[PDB]
Every structure is written in C-alpha cells, then in structure tokens.
Amino acid sequence: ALVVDNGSGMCKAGFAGDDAPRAVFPSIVGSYVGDEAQSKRGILTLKYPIEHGIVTNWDDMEKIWHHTFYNELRVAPEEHPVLLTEAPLNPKANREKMTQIMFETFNTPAMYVAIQAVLSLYASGRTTGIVMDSGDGVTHTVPIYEGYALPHAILRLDLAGRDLTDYLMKILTERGYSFTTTAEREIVRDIKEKLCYVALDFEQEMATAASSSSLEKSYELPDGQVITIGNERFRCPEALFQPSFLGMESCGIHETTFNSIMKCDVDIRKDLYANTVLSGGTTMYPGIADRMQKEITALAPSTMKIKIIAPPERKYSVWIGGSILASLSTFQQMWISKQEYDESGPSIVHRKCF
Amino acid sequence: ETEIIEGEVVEIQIDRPATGTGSKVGKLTLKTTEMETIYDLGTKMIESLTKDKVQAGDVITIDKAT
Amino acid sequence: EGEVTELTPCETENPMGGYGKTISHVIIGLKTAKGTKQLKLDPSIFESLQKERVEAGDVIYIEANSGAVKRQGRCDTYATEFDLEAEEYVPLPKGDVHKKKEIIQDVTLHDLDVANARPQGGQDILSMMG
Amino acid sequence: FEEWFPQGRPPKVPVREVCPVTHRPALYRDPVTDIPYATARAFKIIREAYKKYITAHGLPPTASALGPGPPPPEPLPGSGPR
Amino acid sequence: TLTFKRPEGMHREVYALLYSDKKDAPPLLPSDTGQGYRTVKAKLGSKKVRPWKWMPFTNPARKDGAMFFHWRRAAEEGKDYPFARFNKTVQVPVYSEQEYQLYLHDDAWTKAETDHLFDLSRRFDLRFVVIHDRYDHQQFKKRSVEDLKERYYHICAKLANVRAVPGTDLKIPVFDAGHERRRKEQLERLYNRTPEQVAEEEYLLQELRKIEA
Amino acid sequence: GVYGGDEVGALVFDIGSYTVRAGYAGEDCPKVDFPTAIGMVVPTYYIDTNALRVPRENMEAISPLKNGMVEDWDSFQAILDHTYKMHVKSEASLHPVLMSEAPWNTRAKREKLTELMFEHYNIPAFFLCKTAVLTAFANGRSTGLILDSGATHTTAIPVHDGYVLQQGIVKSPLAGDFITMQCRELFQEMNIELVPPYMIASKEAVREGSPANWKRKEKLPQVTRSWHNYMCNCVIQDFQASVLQVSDSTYDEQVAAQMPTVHYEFPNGYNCDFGAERLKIPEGLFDPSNVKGLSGNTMLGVSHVVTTSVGMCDIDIRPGLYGSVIVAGGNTLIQSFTDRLNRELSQKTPPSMRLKLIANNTTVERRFSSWIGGSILASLGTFQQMWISKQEYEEGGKQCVERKCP
Amino acid sequence: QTGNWPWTSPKDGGLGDVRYRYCLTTLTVPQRCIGFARRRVGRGGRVLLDRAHSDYDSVFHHL
Amino acid sequence: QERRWKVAAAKKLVRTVVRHHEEKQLREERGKKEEQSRLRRIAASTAR
16 A cells, blocks of 8 residues: 655655655656656746645646656556645645546546545554644644544644745845855755754844854855855744734744644643644754743643654654555445446545545 | 256466465366366365376356355 | 453563563453453463364353363354365354343153163273264 | 474465466466466467567567456556566 | 335334434435446446537527526427426416495405405415415504405306306315314414413323223 | 435535635535734725734724625625635636525525625525524434524524424524623723733733733834724633533522632633633523623523524424424533533423433534525435526526525 | 434334344354344445444353 | 544654554563563573
C-alpha cells in the first residue's frame, strides 16, 4: 500500500509499514516535475497546484501524481492501494475530484483520504489532543477528541515557512546582504533551516545580541563568500509568535492554539492542554517547544498541566501516521473499492472517509 | 455422484529431501484431448505413483477429497 | 474447538532453581465461527501437541477432563479450488468455541453382551485372524 | 526451545482467482505455463493468446483479444495479467 | 438462504426513527476489502470503472428551465430527472366570475375572501391549520375555527362538481361543520380541566372498573 | 426508477447573533463557526477571532443583527464577503445558497436579502427557510414544538407539516445575554474585578479569594468601551459554560448550599469556589418572578412559554406538539436544563397527552440544528424544484420569495 | 390507550410501521447474531444495517 | 447514523493505533531482556 502526503511545499511518498518516506521532492511542475523543474526553470515557468494546502489546478496535480508513481516510486498505481492526505477544512469538491482522478485516470484498485492532523496524532500515539501543523504554505490548529477532528474548532493561520523565508530575505537585505532572486531564495532557506532558532525570551535575547557577539554565527555561500548572522537567527522565527513583524493583523500560533482549545467543550480541554503536539517542517526550529509551553502556560489556567509534544521526526509525522494506518488489519475494511466508486460515484469518499 | 479428475500425465517434478513436508512437495501435469493443466501435490500420494510405476503418457484418474 | 492461531508459549525463566528457560503455560487461541478466545493451558499438553502434529491454521479437538488433543484437519479457508488431499480440508466449525455436548444413545443388553464378548482390538493378531 | 515452539503466521486466505476470459471462479489450475482458466474455450483463447507475446514485442497481445467476454456492466481491461 | 429472526420464544421488538438509544451500536456499512486487498486483487484488477461527470440537468418539474449540476455517469446525460415524477399537485377547483354567481357569497363571504382561501388552499395543499395560520384575518375579519373555511371550501367544491358533471351524487364531501365544532369544543373543555377534575374522572372510572368486575 | 438524495453543490448559511455557521450541503456539521460580532474602524471591518481579538485603536465592536433580523447591511455584506473569500474559498456565481432566517422576519428584509444575494453576489439560485423548520428537519420531524434558547431570545415555535405556525410563537428575552448580565451583577456584588486576557502580560498563581498578581501590558493602544465589554463578555461566557448548573427541582437555598462547590480561575489568576449562586442565577429562566431588579412579574418561564405556545395552537395538533418538543440553542446546554424542563412540562402537560422531549443534548446538535436541517433539505432531490432561480428573480423581481419561500 | 407516532412506538402505544422496526438478524459470514437491526438504504445506493441496544445483547451473543 | 458510525470508527482506529504503539515497546523490552538472560546463561555455562 502506498502513502502519498502531497503537502503544500513537498510531496512525501512511500510504502505503508516503512518507518520513513522513500521519496521526497518539491510539489512543483514546469512538463518537468520536482527537481527536474527546479533545475530547469530557465526553460519552463514554474507552478504550484497547491496553494496553502488547497489544490487549485488539477491538471498539474495529475502530473505530480504521475511523477510520484512512475518516476519516484517506480510502481504501477493499478496494483497498490493509495492513501492520500488533505488539508483540514478542504472543500468537499476537492475530495470528489481526487477520488475521480485516482479511480479513472490511474485506475487504482482502492483508495482512502485522511486528515493530516489526525495522522500526526496517530504518529504521536495519542487518542485525544490538539495538533499544530505548520507546513510551507499554511498553518492549522486541529483539536481531536477520540480520533474525531472537531471541525468547528479548527482555525487556519495564513503564516508558514515561505513567509519566514521572505522575512529573512528582508532583514538580511536590511543588514546589507542582497537576496532577491529565486536562486538566492534556496540559499536563504538553507540559512533558515541551519541557523535559526526560537528564543525563550525575545527581549532579553535582543539585548544580549545588542551587547555582545556571543550569539553570532558565520555562514558560507555557494560562491565562497562568507557572511555573519546576528539577531536575525531569532527575529525570523519570532514572526510565528508576532505576525506583526510580517505586517499581518493576526494572532500568533500560541494564541491560535489557545483559541482553538477554547472553542471546544469544557470537559475535554484538560486533555488538549496535556497533548498539544507539534507537526510540520516549520516547527523544527530549536526552542519552539519550550516557548510554546511558556506562552500557553501564561494564557491557560494554573490548574491545567501543559505538555508540548515535539518528536524529532515531526516533519514527517503525517506520513508516518499514514504508514501506520494503512498497515493495520482493522483499517482494511475502510478502503474505498473500485466497485464502490463505479456504483456510487465520487461522493463515496464522503460516505467512507473520516 | 462421481467427482473425479481424469487425464493423461505429461510431466512430473517432485523435490528431494529438504526436512519436514518439503521433502515430498511436487507438481503433476495432466492433459486431455482439448486441455492440459498442472496440479500441485499433497506430499503423501507420491509413494502410490512410484508403487504403480507412473509413466509419461499413461492414463490415470483420482477422486476429489480422497 | 476451532482454528488454532497462536501456538504461543508463556515464560517465567526459572522453576525456582538452576534453569534454562521455563514456560509455565502454553497460550492456545481458538476461533471457529462465533468469536475468538485464548486459553492458557497446562504446559504438559505440549508433548501431546506435537504428537498430533498441529500447526497454525489447523483445527483441533480438546476434551476438558483429560486435556487430550486431537487434530481434525485444517480449515476450508486454505481450500476452495485447492483440493487434492486425503486428510480433507475439513470446514471451519460452526458455533461457539466452547461447547458442552450431551449424547444420548439407545442400546440393548444383548448388544453389550455381544460387544464385550469379543476381542475387538485391532492391534492383536487374533482380532484380524477373526 | 524453538524447534518445540516454531509458532506460525500463515496467510489466512488465498487470492480468489478469476478467469481472464468470461470471468467466474478459476477451475483446474494454470496450464503448463501462464495463468488459470474456467473453461476449455477460455483455455483455447489463452493458447491462441501468448503466441502474440513470445516474440517479446508487437501489438497489445490482450486488448480485447479474441472476444474475451466483452459485455461491460463494468468495463473490462485486456486479458494480460501475466 | 439468509436468515432474520422474529421468535415466539423470546417475544420482543423495538422501534425508533433515528436510533433507539445513545448506547446503540453504530450501523454496519458494506465493504469489499474487509478480508484484505490481496484476497480480492484479481477481482478488482479485472475490471475498469465507468466514468462519472459533473454535468447539467433539467426538468425537476420547473417552469423556468434552469439547469443545475450534479454527479451522474457520463452515459446518462440526456435522461430526464427522476424526481420530477414526485411533482403531484392537489386538485383544487377553479372558477370564473360568471360561475361564482351560483357559488353565491351567502352575504357573509366575498369574492376576494373566496379567492384568498382558494389561493392558500392551492399553495399549502389543503392543510387547513396552516391556511388558518396564514389567513389574512385583518383584511377579511377573524373567520377562524378552521371549520368555517373547511365548510365553504367543501360547499364550493360540491357545487362545482354538481355543475360540471352531467349527473352524479356525492357523499363524503358533505362536510358537517357543527359536528367538528362540537368535537373540538369538547376536546378544549377536557384540555383546560384542572388536575383535580382529572383525578375525579380517574376515581369514577376506577369505581366503574371495580364494581363492574 | 429513482435514486435517493441528490447533491447539487449548494452552500448553507445560518447566521445568528452569537456566531456565523456556514458550510457545504451534504455535510453533517458546519465547516466554519466564527463570531458574528465584528470590528469596525472609521469603513474597514475585521472579522473572525484571529483579527477580532487583536487590540486596535478606535475600533468599535458591533453586530449586524437586531432582534434576530439584519439591520446593518454593510456589516452583513462584509461578513458574507469574508465567508466567501477566506472560508468557502470559491466563486459565488457557481453555488446555490440556502439561508436560514428568523421565524418572525419581516417581508422587507427578505426582499432586501434576496436582492442582495442575486444582484451583488450573482448567485445562480437561492432559497430561504426558517430556523424552526430546519431544526425539526435535523431530527427527522415534520411536526413539533421548537424551543430555541439562544443569546437574545428564548422562543417557542410550533411547526406542522414543515411550516411555522406564526400565530403560536411566544418570545421571551430571558436567554444567554440575560445570564451574562446576571453574572456581571454577581461579580460586582462579589467585588471581583474582571480583567480580560488582552490586558494581561503575565500572571502568578494565588490562593482562593486572594488578590490577583499580574502585570499589565505597557504597549497597549487605547481601545473603545464596546470592544472592552465584548472581551469581558467572552470571559463571562466561559464562566457560564463552566460553572452554572440548573437546579433539578425548585431552588431552595439550604439545599443548594449543601451541594459541592465548583472552582473557577479568571484570566488574571483570581480564583474562588462558587456555591449556591451558580444555581440561583439560571433559576431566573424558569421562575423570573424572584429575580432582583427585574421589571415586573409579567414575564414567563421556559415551561410556561412552551405551554402558552402549545395552548395558542389548534387543539388537533397539540398532541403532535407535546409529543415532539425539540430543544435547541446554546443556552440550553447549561447543566440539567433539559431535565428540569422535562420535569416541569410533565407536571403541567395534561395526563391524556404524552410528553416526549427529543434526545439532542450535544453542543453540535443543539447549536447547529438549523444548519444541519438546511444541509438535509438542500441534499434532497425532491427539493431541487423549490430553488428560486436567477431567471425567476429577473422575471418576477424580489417579490417571488414570498410565493416560493413561505 | 393514548396514541403515538408511527416510530419510536410499537403496537403497545402506536402504529408499528415495520420499516422502523428492528429485529434479530444473522449474517452469512460467520459473525453470529448481531442483535436487533433494520435494513436501510443510505446515500449512494448503499444498503446498511442499523442496530439497537438491548440489555440482553450479551445473551443474544452466545445464545 | 453516518455521524455515529464516523465517531465510533475514529475511536476504534485511535485505540488500535495506541495498542500498536504499546505492543512494540513490550516486544522490544522483552527481546532485550531475553538477550540479557541468554547472556546470563552462556556466561555461566563456561563456569559450569
């Protein structure tokens, strides 16, 4: 069985039962796809079929899935079941289009669609909790009670890794180093992934940076030129907690998490505070878990016991949960079959998948 | 009611000793006027074939479930 | 009775002395039609168990007072367009895993006299001489 | 220990086999080569097939080959599962 | 072959609209892959789905010809919408102004009142409680009761049926409004009883029950 | 033959005074549920919690609705634009819309709404239904009495054969907003200074009944009194959901005092244990005559509202009303509300009539019944002839809604 | 006896329209008596089996 | 009924997932303890 997590920025694909994905590549298309499109950008203009976790061009998504099956994994999709993932609060027509594409275009024998946050909860081994899933294009907070996502309490925040990369470009240009092009964007993304961290106390860290060089670190460009990074290490992740740095009139991830908890019933909130799990590549900065613990403790009552769950493998928690789910014997009754599609239409996905 | 299989043998291939019931697993091919097929063996009937001196092209028949 | 699924030995290391590895139970799981249940049997059953040559997927018969195992065959789930076996892929039984059977048979005293007068045991040569 | 307790993990059920030609459950076995069948007519079509494929190149050997049970209540692929 | 059981030896059954109790087990859904995919890989692999399409359709018994969209198989495009067969209309009579002169207005009704009544009857399918709620009592005085509207609708229908048919006679549309009025009055008088009167009725009924047996 | 339902790509909106429920038809829960109250700066509008809860200078807080009907059409239009852009994320010309309305909505507002949806948003089709009918449909009932206790009103609405009987409606103002006001009065009586979360920079734990220990944010802008009061009411609503409990029988102070207390901690760290006062407050819903400072004994409790509404109906359908009492609204989620209502109605219903309250006590079912009924109704294939089309609007104008949507 | 609806209502109280009636049922796959159940067609043409709670479900199982 | 089926199925799935997680911990701890026991046996065999 195949598990395909076609997230906002990166597509993770592999086989169920494996402990990590076999193929990871960008979710872009030029007719070239992935690294071929990224390397050959001078020939064809690039496009994202997914915008903030929502598919917007299905003809490109078909090309991405064709690349996933026939080039990356090198398998015939008609011989394997396929577990797909969707962002929370997806439009219901997108599920139908996905089911139609899988069954008609690729001729899969069976398929399923699952919510990414629920798979992260499976990966963390919890029955009840709230999942802060921050990807490349969009951030969500999804409270889950006994495996059931509560849709009325889900909150979307339009803040993710691409905005942080742009802000890092901005502040580095303020320092003096020019980074404007898409070629420089990958360099700045590497700097972000390598050097940035979340400060426990932002003001004290800023004062320390102002009064000493202890926090500074050097970086080497591909050209061989060498630069130095100071308070930009923690100014950029701070935009998650202070979106006003980006010019956004919105609450931080901690406040979004607290509000999503408070939209739920009073009985279950103690379980949600104690099982707040972080997911996605944007949560990989050092120190983010302790900062979230501090910030949510500041908001929450003193009687509650806050625990932040941040596994080291949390950038692939969604795929790991999908691999766990697709391997279970209890799940095999939950596949949508080819005959079920042929008799019921794309609306079968609403009957079977939750 | 006779639930028999009958035909003319084509080919036989049975494995050598390999511990356990694998010592006598094999295959057995039968053919008729308009059909032929290859049948796996239950590891206990091979001694009957050797006792009866099974020969290529000889005609046999068996009763299912016995 | 039912389809065996476990053949799982328990373990407690030592019999309160110098030891290799000690089992102290044998877990035997049966499922037939109605459900599934695990039985932690006496370890002494193990000798009789491979004497009957049982494996996973077989279907067996065990009596409560004696604990005597008997192999009936293996299920029809490994059958249905396989065939070709004298043991017969005996079908997966119906009913509960645990059964209490009340057998009533009618017999005359003359039948008892005739049956007990003869040496019906086939293991003696004089029986087959008969 | 283990030669007294090998344990087991058998496949609980097999793959339910269907003839490529006119469907229904498979009968007999595979031939001396290839894949199982239900009737002598299916066997005849399968042996008329595989002469189109021993060349290891050519047209589709099985795309609606020789009328392999073609009424589509639900449409059929070609009879080339081997 | 397949068995369901309604035994005499246990003798019980339950009824419910949505569900009997919050402790009810969930339903059982159909599935093909309950025994694993490898069990049924050949059965699924030997078949191909019929294509579906998001496609326009017409005539749910609409007068405007507006085309909405839905999912159906692509081979079923031009078929008329099945649910139009449900569009059944109540046979309310119609009349002209000449015909109203022998539906003469009793010197209590008017042409406008009768037209309003028949319009509401056509709209609400002779649900006279709903028609009474929607009746314009301000413009046409408090008619009320529901029997004074039922009886005028039915006498108009009887006269219209007697006119238009060369010969017949009609039993059940003879609406006895006084009987209904007395019935509803008795029901109201029983409804507004205090609990002591209900206890008195129960005592007297129990006395009859015990003394007659 | 035929088929079952039919899904047509419709949208369902149910807009209340407290929150806006929206989503796609055929789903069993609303996709989104965000507050109806919005910020205005002058105009520029801020909608949903993430933008609403950030403090801002000169930003007033308003509602588009008054008495369950639309007053500020600019705010309503802004809310709909936000819902289409950020939440539905689809073009409005493609999706039919089914909208909920109040049972007592006037003609002019229905006409104005139809004109708005057809001429501005250019939707292809429209339908307008009342809350009580959809609440009945969500529970599979065509006939029944809907008791809706929301924020502004506690209303008994009789329904029969899918139509509201408007002459049987009984409104009362005793609802969640009244409970919030009573909680404010309680905190003033207890000398509990209420600090909303936005003012707090940090806090420290303290003992029961002791003064709070907290630091105020220095970088705050000056904020209007309306937004501050809304933020305070957001705290008091959590207090309502947590602490309050309806007495199972008629309130006796000596009995409620012996009950166990309930601990509650405010955002600034102040905490105390609440006793009989948590049960005295919601008792005014049922026996408002004992409420302090309330204007006269003329007003009705919930049970008396139900009985008056049923008694104002035709005698033939009263068995069908008492045999299906469908409790709805967020204010009915106070603990032991439904049991008290059932007992009181059993003590007042005639013995000849069987009483049956529908089992509905969940947050989703109580708060989103109208939306669920709208999704059910839009999912019917029989319903698809009942839409008002754009062609019908262009031919007959906005007056067709009175004929087509009773 | 006072009347009642067609549903939630046996003949001991009201009209027992059998489409709302749950009855004991058995399946050809070996999973036993599932207790009281109706047959209902859902969305998509799919035939489901509703189920109702009984205090003797533990007796209907291993009956 | 679809709502009730959905919540029940979700509950069963999470319960099976956590059981799957726990069984791996039990398997690994029993395996390493058996390894240590076999070390205890083979080391003392030479002394025997």
